[PDB]
Paper text:
The hemagglutinin (HA) protein of influenza viruses binds to sialic acid receptors on host cells and is the major target of neutralizing antibodies. In a previous study, we described five naturally occurring human mAbs that potently inhibit the 1918 [name] pandemic influenza virus. One notable difference between these two antibodies, however, is that mAb [name] not only inhibits the 1918 [name] virus, but also 1943 as well as select 1947 and 1977 human [name] viruses. A greater understanding of the basis for such broadly cross-reactive antibodies may suggest novel vaccine or therapeutic approaches to influenza virus infection. This study provides a detailed characterization of one such antibody, [name], and highlights common, emerging properties of cross-reactive anti-head antibodies.
To better understand the mechanism of [name] neutralization and its ability to cross-react with [name] viruses separated by decades of virus evolution, we determined the crystal structure of Fab [name] in complex with SC1918 HA using diffraction data that extend to 3.3 Å, but we report a nominal resolution of 3.55 Å due to anisotropy. The crystal structure of the [name]-SC1918 complex contains two complete HA trimers in the asymmetric unit. Each HA protomer (6 in all for the two trimers) is bound by a single copy of the [name] Fab in the expected stoichiometry of 3 Fabs per HA trimer. Of the 6 Fabs in the asymmetric unit, only two are fully ordered. Fab [name] binds an epitope at the apex of the HA spike, in the HA1 “head” region (overview). The [name] epitope contains several residues that typically contact the sialoglycan receptor, including 135, 153, 183, 190, 194, 222, and 225 (RBS with glycan, contact residues labeled). [name] also contacts a number of more variable residues outside the RBS, including 133A, 145, 156, 159, 186, 187, 189, 192, 193, 196, 227, and 228.
Author numbering:
A (entry chain E): 9 to 54, 54A, 55 to 83, 83A, 84 to 95, 95A, 96 to 114
B (entry chain F), C (entry chain D), D (entry chain B): 1 to 171
E (entry chain E): 275 to 325
Write the structure that this text describes.
Amino acid sequence: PGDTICIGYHANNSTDTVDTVLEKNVTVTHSVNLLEDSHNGKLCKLKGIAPLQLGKCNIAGWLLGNPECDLLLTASSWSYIVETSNSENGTCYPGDFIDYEELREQLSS
Amino acid sequence: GLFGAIAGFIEGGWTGMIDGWYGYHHQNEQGSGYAADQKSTQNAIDGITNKVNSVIEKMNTQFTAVGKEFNNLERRIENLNKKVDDGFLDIWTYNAELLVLLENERTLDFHDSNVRNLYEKVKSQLKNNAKEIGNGCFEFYHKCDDACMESVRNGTYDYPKYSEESKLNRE
Amino acid sequence: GLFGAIAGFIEGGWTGMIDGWYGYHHQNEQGSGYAADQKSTQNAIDGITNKVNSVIEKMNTQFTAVGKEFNNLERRIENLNKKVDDGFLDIWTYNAELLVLLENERTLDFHDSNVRNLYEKVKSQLKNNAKEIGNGCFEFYHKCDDACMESVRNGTYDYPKYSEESKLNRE
Amino acid sequence: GLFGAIAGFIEGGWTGMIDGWYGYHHQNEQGSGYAADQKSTQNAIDGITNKVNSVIEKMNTQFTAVGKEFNNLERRIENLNKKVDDGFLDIWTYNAELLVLLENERTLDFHDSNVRNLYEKVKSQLKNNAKEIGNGCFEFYHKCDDACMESVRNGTYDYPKYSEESKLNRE
Amino acid sequence: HDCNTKCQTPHGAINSSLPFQNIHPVTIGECPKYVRSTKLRMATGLRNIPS
Ligand SMILES: *[C@@H]1O[C@H](CO)[C@@H](O)[C@H](O)[C@H]1NC(C)=O
Ligand SMILES: *[C@@H]1O[C@H](CO)[C@@H](O)[C@H](O)[C@H]1NC(C)=O
Ligand SMILES: *[C@@H]1O[C@H](CO)[C@@H](O)[C@H](O)[C@H]1NC(C)=O
Ligand SMILES: *[C@@H]1O[C@H](CO)[C@@H](O)[C@H](O)[C@H]1NC(C)=O
């Protein structure tokens, strides 16, 4: 019935699991996630500058000034350029826009 | 575990020790209780925090990396771009998953090591003034009050002081 | 090895134990023989199998992926392609060789750990009812028949039952 | 350390031992001194040399790799080239830094292991002919001259020769 | 919307100091490295054995 001292380790109600080399699904008392899987569903500013919204126009339609793109005439500064699924107005007169992809890469600058 | 202690000769953990990863449970005439070992716990916390921070810190952020666009006469370069992006993705995914696996194993083993070393430390402090049960516990052959227990905990236990009494009670 | 047992204080292995990675050899009045320790062996097999499977599993397949062709005014992009392929080759070759090196070390060390822990496990069951030879063997101070031996092997050895007898032969 | 010896139960190193990584200090009537353990030291040197050589050896050199140039209508492919070069730089810098961190830890732990295993080697040679102090030291219960010490150093200590004297002095 | 971010993807912006992400390979700004993993969790504490 003598005095006693024991050596031991922590347990808690944590349900966090990690995988290891030798064993899957090990429950651990504490852990940190290194993988981000959450986003906010919005288009935000970059460097505190808003993106440019072309809306129903695309970059060709914007730059050439497709008459459907008149709403873009006031646009002046941006962090990145946003095309959407309804951007269908570009070259209303049929033909080829030469070095269009290069111009697009350049214009993002 | 590598060091044989956690889930080893010390079968389970203590929900009653809320202030540390490793520590002590005592029972005497005066009472019963848990106490964290501050030194080993703080060293382990600092070490592991340094490990996680060191893994994250080495990842300079991905600055702008954007998709390239291609015309109908550019299939080869589009495919080159896709090959590069996919290849880098294979590399970073493989390394991150495998690295997390390996590092998790090392971390668990690190804890097992810290528990084994605390147990063997107490064992070597007490020597034959107590008997090892085997489940991480020691039963004293002498009366050991709160001050004595604390002496064990801060590594100042006085073996000669209780040696004679212990030798008397052991026989 | 890190844990000092394999190629350590136990100089060699047993070609006579064909049914497990780790286990026991005994000699007593009823006869002599080997028996694998099933639990540690199976745990090690499962662990190592999980390791190999995890190495192979992380190589998400390469879906159809091909070489590119170039005309005589496209040397720069051809060279970009070659730089990419060679670069990936450098990374994957270095990583594969080094990873295999380090993991091989870890596997051998894992075995060494498992042997040391099994030995210390038996040791802690028997305490002073046997004397340690030093070569992984324990010699009993009491008679230990086949049932007793099996009790030792499965961790149900009854120390108090044989303590007085052991004490008698030891003195 | 992981194995509890270096910066552990053996608190500090010896600036007086100039001829090895690991070894022994003895003091007796004939005199006093440090002596390196040659076998374990050379094994450790060989191991670490193989580790370093293996790290350097796996980087088959980079043969000519030169920057590509692009005109003002080739910005997208120029950016592909930059993406490739930056991606490779991110990968090799992260891998080199993290690898050096992890391997340094392993190396320090390896040394700690070698000291612990040397200590247990001496302990198991001497058995109860000496008492463990706890600071890496053993006190003989018998007189142990230069030849005896040397038997310890070269792993040939004779327990029965000094057993009787030890049993007499211990009691 | 008028929010600010360091990292934008086509699904939405990401706000995180984490090294890896599984939302999208396409990113603009200052973002985590894209990987295919569905989880990357480092142990910090020990095996949890409440039993
Ligand atoms: C788990 O236990 C901790 C400690 O009391 C507590 O803070 C927490 O609320 C518990 N889990 C729940 C109910 O969220
Ligand atoms: C350890 O415990 C004793 C018991 O009270 C105390 O007197 C002493 O100051 C402590 N030693 C340390 C490490 O300060
Ligand atoms: C182990 O062996 C002993 C002796 O035969 C037996 O009494 C006991 O039931 C066994 N325990 C297990 C784990 O089966
Ligand atoms: C060990 O020491 C003894 C006594 O000095 C010596 O005779 C012998 O050669 C040594 N043995 C070995 C294996 O080096």
